[PDB]
């Protein structure tokens, strides 16, 4: 179950 | 940039005896970046419909891939794996050693 999409680097 | 050259191992899924079906495996690992050319050779000629695993990497960030094909060894047929990568002057050939 993936981590939710987060902030770009 | 720091690049890493691929390690190569050529081997079968099960121990080999002539006339039975097996899988020929070419495992390339330890490399960076991830673009790589890998062919399985039969007496010099590239085999077709070879498959491979989904790209992944180890804890040190280097990539690894398994290239494999179903086959049937014989006492005469020779097998090898041909690998090219940005770190390699020319493609490297690793023959399948029977008694590895």
């Amino acid at each position: 179950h993936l981590a939710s999409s987060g902030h770009s680097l | 940039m720091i690049q890493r050259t691929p390690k190569i191992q050529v081997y079968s899924r099960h121990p080999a005896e002539n006339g039975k079906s097996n899988f020929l495996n070419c495992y390339v690992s330890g490399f960076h970046p991830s673009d790589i050319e890998v062919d399985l050779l039969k007496n010099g000629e590239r085999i077709e419909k070879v498959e491979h695993s989904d790209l992944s990497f180890s804890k040190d960030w280097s990539f690894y891939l398994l290239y494999y094909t179903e086959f049937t060894p014989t006492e005469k047929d020779e097998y090898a794996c041909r690998v090219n990568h940005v770190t390699l002057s020319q493609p490297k050939i690793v023959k399948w050693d029977r008694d590895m």
Partner: protein, 276 residues
């Protein structure tokens, strides 16, 4: 009987040959169970183990949408990193991420993970406290400041302690007949003469799972660490793994050498000799 879930992200730019490719694969222990490739004709998160297939459409839609979003976010991240290092738009670069959770036999969180690397070198990592970051350089310090502003560590901690562990426990139960089964190595010792003077003793371990294994040669009960050639553990293609260890011995002295094998699938550790 500890277990882990890990996701591996790779994003690679290729100027002149389209937008950066994004690839995501998921593992439980040494078993791959999903994949996504932004270069597929119709990109979707797809199953790679039988026990994940039973998940319903809302699962596959969620994982596909996250991965399609990530494809775009990792393209932004690659643009940002190029800037952070004052790099030209002509060169190819790689961004990697791996994250996940480890649990013990009782299923409790042992520790979580989230690490990132740029062109193969460590860039930023979430600390074991799941609340702070370690940045490799002044470029990663920019990422850290951005991520502190967006409270990313907080979200990682909630994921790593919550859904990561809960879904890993669920996978472990749905796949228990393989994920919770350790298969021991099939072993033997072979003998390859070099000259009248020496020969090679090679100790083989085949068909084992998981990949974790210890293979050592001893001469008179002392380990031959610097003298042993260990090959990298390799996949057989049928979920199992292979490894060998070799030592060159003086001819006639073969019986001084013992091969020692440790694996979770083994009732007892093994000691093996050459049997001519």
């Amino acid at each position: 009987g500890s277990h882990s879930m890990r996701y591996f992200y790779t994003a690679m730019s290729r100027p002149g040959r389209g937008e950066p490719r994004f690839i995501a694969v998921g593992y439980v222990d040494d078993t791959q169970f999903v994949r996504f490739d932004s270069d597929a004709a119709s990109p979707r998160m797809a199953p790679r183990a039988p026990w994940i297939e039973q998940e319903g459409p809302e699962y596959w839609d969620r994982e596909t949408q996250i991965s399609k979003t990530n494809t775009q976010t990792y393209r932004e991240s690659l643009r940002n990193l190029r800037g952070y290092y004052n790099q030209s738009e002509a060169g190819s670069h790689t961004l990697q991420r791996m994250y996940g959770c480890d649990v013990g036999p009782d299923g409790r969180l042992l520790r979580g993970h989230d690490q990132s690397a740029y062109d193969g070198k460590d860039y930023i990592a979430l600390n074991e406290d799941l609340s702070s970051w370690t940045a490799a350089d002044t470029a990663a310090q920019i990422t850290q400041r951005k991520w502190e502003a967006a409270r990313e560590a907080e979200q990682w901690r909630a994921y790593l302690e919550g859904l990561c562990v809960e879904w890993l426990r669920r996978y472990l139960e749905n796949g228990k007949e393989t994920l919770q089964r350790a298969d021991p190595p099939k072993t033997h010792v072979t003998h390859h003469p070099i000259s009248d003077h020496e020969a090679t003793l090679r100790c083989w371990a085949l068909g084992f799972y998981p990949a974790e294994i210890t293979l050592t040669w001893q001469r008179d009960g002392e380990d031959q660490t610097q003298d042993t050639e260990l090959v990298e553990t390799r996949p057989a293609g049928d979920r199992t793994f292979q490894k060998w260890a070799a030592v060159v011995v003086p001819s006639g002295e073969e019986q001084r050498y013992t091969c020692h094998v440790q694996h979770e699938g083994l009732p007892k550790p093994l000691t093996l000799r050459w049997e001519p």
